[PDB]
Design a protein around this nucleic acid. Structure first.
Lengths: 115, 116
DNA sequence: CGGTCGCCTATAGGC
DNA sequence: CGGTCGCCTATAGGC
């Protein structure tokens, strides 16, 4: 549910977008001790409290460290933000956002934690 | 479920292909008295009795008259015949073959008459 | 593969 | 559209 604290520009001024049972916040993990992988990938779709104004927030890196990030603004174009979000999730999990109740991790890609 | 009599080349030598609940024989109708439409379109996928050899049979025209037709042969390629068949049905009904239990006629397109 | 970019191909649609 | 065509573009995916 919460805006990711590291999103300094929007924590306070915004909330994670929801609609029914869809909630656009996800945390991905890939751990593989053989090749030295202990990394996260976080994605959020953010509506401002101020107006109907949108943005997608992505942050990634080694567990522990605060990593690097990307904020992508979408003005009032909810459809765009949803695409960007869904597409990113897909690139990193090889599952669709829509089929996440039946999530199945794939070798070589990130796994998902439930919220 | 019969080979269409007008298919002279294959009536006697062949039968309508079936596969589970799928039976590849369909009759389409478009009647619209306002624009003067009283036309059928018949499609059949035919397996020979002789061997595993395939063909799609299409006949169409004004109700009453025997119209024109097209026989398309597919040798042993069942998959091809099924595509040709399904694709034609789609062009003329704007429904998929797969979803025909829940068929919904579309304005401007053919309707499907449900067999026996 | 964190980011991002961009051929080629195979279709699907407009005309 | 009842048959057939074939350009050109826009689009989506694989690599």
């Amino acid at each position: 549910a919460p805006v990711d604290p590291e999103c300094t520009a929007k924590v306070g001024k915004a909330h994670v977008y929801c609609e029914g049972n869809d909630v656009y916040d996800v945390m991905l993990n890939q751990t593989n001790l053989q090749f030295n992988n202990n990394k996260y990938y976080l994605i959020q779709l953010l509506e401002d409290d101020a107006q109907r104004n949108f943005s997608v927030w992505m942050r990634w890196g080694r567990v522990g460290k605060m990593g690097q990030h990307s904020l992508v603004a979408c003005s009032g174009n909810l459809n765009k933000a949803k695409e960007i979000f869904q597409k990113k999730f897909l690139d990193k999990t090889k599952n669709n956002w829509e089929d996440r109740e039946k999530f199945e991790k794939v070798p070589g890609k990130y796994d998902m934690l439930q919220m």
